[PDB]
Amino acid sequence: EGVIMSELKLKPLPKVELPPDFVDVIRIKLQGKTVRTGDVIGISILGKEVKFKVVQAYPSPLRVEDRTKITLVTHP
């Protein structure tokens, strides 16, 4: 039997980098919903509007769970 691991990659549209505690809080809010590459959703955080685009779902479609890993992409 092989090992199974699902993942979702996301990119912020404004230029901002959030500390590593954000990714856990976003996973708890979103998990249970299904995601596909190309979808776009808006989240209000601390009185500031941020748009997030879904870069790639592996595999697509998938549901987000605490066992699914999520990674934030940014440029140097």
CB atoms within 10 A of CB 35: 19
- CATH for 1-76 is 3.10.330.10
3-class secondary-structure state, position 25: helix
Other Cβ atoms less than 10 A from the Cβ of 54: the count is: 17
The continuous run of DSSP H or E covering 30 comes out as helix 20-30
Give domain limits for the chain: 1-76
d(CA 5, CA 2): 10
Q: In the numeric block, which tokens belong to residue 74?
A: 């940014």
Rounded Cα–Cα distance for residues 31 and 11 (Å) = 17
Q: Residues 7, 15, 67, CA angle at the centre, nearest 5°?
A: 15
Residue located via tokens 């993942």: 7
Question: For 35, how many CA atoms within 13 A lie in the half-sphere containing its CB?
Answer: 27
Elucidation technique: NMR
Spatial separation of the C-alpha atoms in residues 17 and 28, rounded to whole Å = 19
